[PDB]
Amino acid sequence: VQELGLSLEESRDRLRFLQLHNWLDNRSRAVFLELTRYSPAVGLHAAVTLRLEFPAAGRALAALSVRPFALRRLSAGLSLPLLTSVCLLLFAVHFAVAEARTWHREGRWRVLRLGAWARWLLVALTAATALVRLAQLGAADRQWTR
Amino acid sequence: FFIIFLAYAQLAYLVFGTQVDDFSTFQECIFTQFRIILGDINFAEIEEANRVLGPIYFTTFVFFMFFILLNMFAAIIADTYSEVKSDLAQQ
Amino acid sequence: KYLKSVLRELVTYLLFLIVLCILTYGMMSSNVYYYTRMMSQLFLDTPVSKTEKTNFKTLSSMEDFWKFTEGSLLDGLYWKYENLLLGVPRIRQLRVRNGSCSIPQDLRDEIKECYDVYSVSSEDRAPFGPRNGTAWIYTSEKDLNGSSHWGIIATYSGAGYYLDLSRTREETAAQVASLKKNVWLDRGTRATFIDFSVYNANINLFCVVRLLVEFPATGGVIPSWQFQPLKLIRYVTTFDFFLAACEIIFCFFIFYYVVEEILEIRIHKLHYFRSFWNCLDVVIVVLSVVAIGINIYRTSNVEVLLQFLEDQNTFPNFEHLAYWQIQFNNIAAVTVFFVWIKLFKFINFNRTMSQLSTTMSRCAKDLFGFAIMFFIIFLAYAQLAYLVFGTQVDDFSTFQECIFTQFRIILGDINFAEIEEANRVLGPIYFTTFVFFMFFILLNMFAAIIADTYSEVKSDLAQQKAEM
Amino acid sequence: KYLKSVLRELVTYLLFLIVLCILTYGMMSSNVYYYTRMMSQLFLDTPVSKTEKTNFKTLSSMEDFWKFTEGSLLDGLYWKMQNRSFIFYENLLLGVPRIRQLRVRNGSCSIPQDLRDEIKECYDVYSVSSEDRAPFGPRNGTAWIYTSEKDLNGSSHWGIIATYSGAGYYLDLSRTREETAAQVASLKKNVWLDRGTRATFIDFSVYNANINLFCVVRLLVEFPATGGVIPSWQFQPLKLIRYVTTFDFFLAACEIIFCFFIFYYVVEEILEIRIHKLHYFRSFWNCLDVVIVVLSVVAIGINIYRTSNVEVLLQFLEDQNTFPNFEHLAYWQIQFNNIAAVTVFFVWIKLFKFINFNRTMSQLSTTMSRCAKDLFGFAIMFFIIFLAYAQLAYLVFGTQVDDFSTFQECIFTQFRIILGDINFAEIEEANRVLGPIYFTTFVFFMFFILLNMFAAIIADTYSEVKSDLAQQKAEM
Amino acid sequence: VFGKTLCRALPELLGVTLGLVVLGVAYAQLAWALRLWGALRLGAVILRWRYHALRGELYRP
Amino acid sequence: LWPWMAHVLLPYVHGNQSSPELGPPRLRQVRLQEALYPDPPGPRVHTCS
Ligand SMILES: *[C@@H]1O[C@H](CO)[C@@H](O)[C@H](O)[C@H]1NC(C)=O
Ligand SMILES: *[C@@H]1O[C@H](CO)[C@@H](O)[C@H](O)[C@H]1NC(C)=O
Ligand SMILES: *[C@@H]1O[C@H](CO)[C@@H](O)[C@H](O)[C@H]1NC(C)=O
């Protein structure tokens, strides 16, 4: 890693220092420049990443990605993304017990029909939708406090 | 037809409507699909916004709305015409 | 007694077809196009000067035009591509007069004069500037031996203020500079023509060149060019005589066809105009007679084409000789198409081909009936597009352009980047409703009609065969 | 009903056939085959020298190989650098080659006692017990001392000639074309493949650094005991770097889906044969499913085991100072090719198992041959109209468009218009009348009246096929 | 009728597309079918036959 | 890369009050330990190897 410094002048100092000392002329697969961006007028953050890959020494190919998101955190109370993520988790349980109550009633050999497969996909989708937002909310707290 | 059309339109708006500009607004999403029907737009940049849902969306859209749902509009009409002719010829 | 008639008709038609095909391909050489393209590159593609980036086809003002006529035009006209000039070029202008316009009384003090759009009833006929010679005095159309042009903005007459240039570069440049010193292109000028002709002895092929610059009444410059290569190949090598004999054979064939047609129309005094194989037989002979009389003109008035390699000082008037060469291809190309169509008269005897033709014929009344319901909506949409997008799109600037744009949209060649921004509302509505009403509803109706007709014709034919 | 017994088994069989077809299509190596063909052309068809007429496929004397190694084989393979290995600067060979000679031992046969005054000895064919092990001529090092089969990474193969094992003299090439030529000349001057020899072989590798395809090329020559020798070559495209990009991800997903479908089919078919009628073999429907499942499982296991380790290529690329033991990898690749042929046969068997609705195989040819007649009749009308329009366009727009310039180009222009590549900028500009008319009439008569006749023909054909089937099959 | 005509005709549609894709694989094995099928307009006739059958069945009650 | 960062990146990250930042950048690098041998110039060599 290279922290690049804080001020413009010291940034130039570090840049020229690692420029002359052959920091990037070797094998040196990638470069991976990526910093950040904030916008308080709309309240959005942005993850910016600039990358060069060297297939063979001599030339590079470039690629950049700018992902804008909103940093909403789990420790902020009972915001909407949590309310409609514990309610969706209840619809993934009422839809599961309603399948056990038919698995038991019909007994064995319910497999090989659409009704016993097209409803298990719904559970495996609702559970994922509920459990991904929670992970995102937790990661928000962890990264923000760090 | 138009319920599934809007179902594709809103999904495209939510997924690609941040990094394409061809799906930036809902109206643009609708007009893009209408242009897909004509075979006008090229998907050179769709996968850049997302790769899991990039080509999958295009392929499923084309298959389901250009070979199974866009025909029923033809078949029906054809069938109707036939019976109408009979409904005169017998008379 | 019946097969003999079919065989004689078939062999006569094959002989006529081979004569027509061999005759119309002896008048097409690979040089007639390359020479035109090279001449277009010589004038229309070189920069106006050796410093600017604007060529003739991208002019934007009168000053650029003055740069061109004292520039690339002279370089290409008097070369260091390997052609020579015959006669002498001529430059003419058409202008309107001050006071052909009606300023509103409210702001009369701010505008002292306005010039109207070009029109014969509002043309200038008075001398201006130094009343020295022929470049500053109005000359009538008769005294100029001219004719209309039908340019892009309007149809300009043959009169105007003209000037004949010199045979070589020095006096031509001096004379055009003398014109530029005075104001020969005032605000009243509405059109400018430049005419000349070249021979290019290296490969025997003439060329007549006419360039036009139109200044609309709203400022700006619109250029338009026209090159037309001519030929004087009569009885040259040992390949010609063949075409000369073929022309006589074709004329005899047309005489035979017209006498047969008059015999048939005398026997069948009427009802001869419904089989649709007789209308296509009189159209062909009429077009061939027209194309036979038009070929005589261009063949009779070609003796002067020579009286100009003598290096004289006069402007040749080759406009008519180059105008009829275009109206002769537009006739010799429709006759070939209508002759190649006629093969269906003889290949409709095979059972599958007869069934196909019967299918295509029994549905020729429902197809035409629906072609009116289709084209009423196709014009109701076009007029709406013309009214909404008719000033800022360059594709709907005229009604015909609207129709052709809709036809291209049917094929799927829509821009939609200009439609959506020209009118952010009522434009997308037009596009979406047009696509829905055409691709989903009105295009399947043709297929339904054709499919139903084909199915019923096949069933009828199978039933009839089963009866026997 | 017909929703759980007639709508699922057929659909599942069709899906399995589709998956098998996809897996078979994702197994055709085009670039590897092209590289192997180019290498064979530059090697098998390579003569001895400019003046000599001894090629790889024309082995007729013991000096044919010696003269071939110095010559065209040194031009198509041992090309100088810019000493690298690139003939056309694009065929990058991998590593260095190696040479082996399985010769007959000194005194590999016996001479008759009645003619012992004139007959010395003879040599037998190549075999495990007929391979030389002691020195043969001047053996300064390994140039004439045979290496053990187990100690030289060799084993019996039993190819087209004999079972040449790993025994025999071994030698390694150099890292320079000049050095390789000098070594070949030294080996040809001395007794390397003498009259008491039985087989020869050489093994090299090709990388083609511009293309991710590292394959092996092995040439062989069978020196029969009745004089002469027969040469040949074989290319093994063995690679284990498949996981590259989105195409590799799609292939892996398809393989996983096929494995899951096979497991589900086995689960669904392993219960109705155990707790139900067993020993059903001559039923043409119960043994076939079991055989297909077993064959699919065996093929999947063999394919997985073939790519158990991928460290050979990485080790060769990290250290390329010698010739790796690529014979085992080539044998594994040959076994994989045989398994691929067996998988094609299994796909044919699956197609046969998708023929449970039989008797519809040859009773419909009379209708297809009539549909073909109708299409042929239609193609005449379509082409007559097309050439009429092309001639019109070529005569009218001939000299002023650069698109309708030559007749052979007007056809392509009209085809592109049909596919939707219209320009319409010059067409209207070159002629404001008969320019729009041509385009409009062409579109109207090519998309509304003549393209809708092609569909109606097929519609009628399908309707009559349905009618005659639903008549005869459902009447008697 | 719209749901039924879509569900019953589904196997034939999948059979046709499978045939087209295997034909394309065979064609490419020697070393675009979208335009071909889109010009054959098959799916339309397959749907039309089932639609006519279902309408006839539903007409009587 | 060096003129690129010295021309646009620095004037964008640092300024008067030009586009608030919220955290300094970073330049993490991967070496690959297997120093590469190049190809003669011209067209780009396929994609990557
Ligand atoms: C044009 O005519 C009007 C009419 O009187 C006159 O006032 C004006 O001066 C004229 N302009 C020129 C340039 O002759
Ligand atoms: C008018 O023409 C004469 C010669 O014909 C010339 O000497 C004179 O300069 C011209 N007038 C002007 C204003 O140049
Ligand atoms: C028009 O034709 C007549 C007849 O030869 C000729 O005398 C006259 O000069 C021509 N007009 C011009 C402007 O040359």
Element (H, E) at C209: strand C207-214
* Cβ atoms of residues D48 and D64 within 8 Å: yes
Distance CA(D172)–CA(D193), nearest Å, equals 15
Residue C437 makes CB contacts below 8 A (sequence gap 6+) with C377
* Cβ atoms of residues C207 and C197 within 8 Å: yes
Interface of D with E in 14-53 (CB under 8 A): 14, 17-18, 21, 24-25, 28, 30
Q: Per the CB < 8 Å rule, is F40 touching D89?
A: yes
* Cβ atoms of residues C130 and C182 within 8 Å: yes
* Cβ atoms of residues D183 and D97 within 8 Å: no
D–E interface: beta-carbon pairs under 8 A: 44
- Which atom of ligand 2 is closest in space to residue C132's alpha carbon? 1
Distance CA(C83)–CA(C201), nearest Å, equals 7
DSSP letter for each residue of chain A: -----SSHHHHHHHHHHHHHTTSSSSS--B--EE---EETTTTEEEEEEEEEE-SSTT--EEEEEEEEE----GGG-S-HHHHHHHHHHHHHHHHHHHHHHHHHHH-S---SSGGGTHHHHHHHHHHHHHHHHHHHHHHHHHHHH-
Residues in chain B, how many?
Answer: 91
SS3 string of D132-198?
CCCCCCCCCCCCCCEECCCCCCCCCCCCCCCCCCCCEEEEECCCCHHHHHHHHHHHHHCCCCCCCEE
DSSP letter for each residue of D388-447: HHHHHHHHHSSSSSSSSSSHHHHHHHHHHHHHT----HHHHHH-SSSSHHHHHHHHHHHH
Cα D364 to chain centroid, rounded: 35
- Which atom of ligand 3 is closest in space to residue C315's alpha carbon? 14
Long-range pairs of D362-365 with CB within 8 A, sequence gap ≥ 24: D364/D465, D364/D469
Please report which residue ranges of C307-443 form alpha helices under DSSP H. 319-341, 351-362, 366-388, 399-411, 419-422, 428-435
On the CB side of C40, CA atoms within 13 Å amount to 17
Residues with CB under 6 A from ligand 3: C 144-145, 315
Quote the tokens at residue C282: 């009189």
A113 chain-D contacts, CB cut-off 8 A: 4
* Cβ atoms of residues A74 and A134 within 8 Å: yes
Ligand nearest the Cα of residue C99 is: 1
Angle at C14 between CA C12 and CA C17, to 5 degrees: 110
Nearest to C203 by CA among C84, C301, C87, C320: C84
* Cβ atoms of residues A132 and A124 within 8 Å: no
Closest-CA distance, A84 to chain F, in angstroms, reads: 30
Pairing of strands A61-69, A38-39: unpaired
Q: Which residues of B does the annotation place in the binding site for Ca(2+)?
A: 38
Nearest CB to E39 within list D10, D451, D466 = D451
How far away, in angstroms, is C99 Cα from ligand 1 center?
A: 7
Nearest CB to C455 within list D377, D417, D460 = D460
Which residue of chain C has the CA closest to B85? C452
Phi first, then psi: give them for residue D103, nearest 5 degrees.
-100, 160
Instruction: Tell the residue number behind the tokens 């080539």, with chain if given.
Output: D330
C459 chain-B contacts, CB cut-off 8 A: none
Nearest to C409 by CA among D25, D170, B34, D357: B34
Q: Is D220 helix (H, G, I), strand (E, B) or coil?
A: strand
Burial of D288 (0-12, 13-18, 19+ CB in 10 A): middle
DSSP letter for each residue of D253-274: HHHHHHHHHHHHHHHHHSSTTT
Q: DSSP letter for C136, please.
A: G
Distance CA(A102)–CA(D287), nearest Å, equals 35
Residues with CB under 6 A from ligand 1: C 98-99, 112-113
Nearest to B51 by CA among D350, D245, A111, A64: D245
Q: DSSP letter for D105, please.
A: P
Q: Is C273 helix (H, G, I), strand (E, B) or coil?
A: coil
Residue C161 makes CB contacts below 8 A (sequence gap 6+) with C92, C93, C94, C95, C134, C135, C136, C137, C138, C139
> Residue D37 carries which side chain, given as an amino acid letter?
R
Closest-CA distance, B70 to chain E, in angstroms, reads: 9
Nearest CB to D377 within list C30, C330, C352 = C352
Q: Per the CB < 8 Å rule, is D381 touching C455?
A: no
> Residue A36 carries which side chain, given as an amino acid letter?
T
- Which atom of ligand 1 is closest in space to residue C98's alpha carbon? 1
Closest C-alpha to ligand 2, atom 8: C132
Cα A75 to chain centroid, rounded: 18
Q: Tell whether D419 is in a known binding site.
A: yes
Angle at D147 between CA D141 and CA D148, to 5 degrees: 155
Cα C445 to chain centroid, rounded: 35
Ligand nearest the Cα of residue C108 is: 1
Any CB–CB contact under 8 A between D7 and chain E?
yes
Q: Is B37 helix (H, G, I), strand (E, B) or coil?
A: helix
Residue B38 makes CB contacts below 8 A (sequence gap 6+) with C409, C412, C414, C435, C439
How far away, in angstroms, is D182 Cα from ligand 3 center?
A: 92
Q: DSSP letter for C49, please.
A: S
Best of C132, C179, C183 for a ligand 2 pocket test (most atoms within 8 Å of beta carbon): C132
Distance CA(D464)–CA(D449), nearest Å, equals 23
Q: DSSP letter for C198, please.
A: E
Which stretches of chain D sit within 8 Å of chain F by CB? 82, 89, 209-212, 318
Distance CA(D11)–CA(E14), nearest Å, equals 9
Distance CA(C185)–CA(C172), nearest Å, equals 18
Closest C-alpha to ligand 3, atom 2: C145
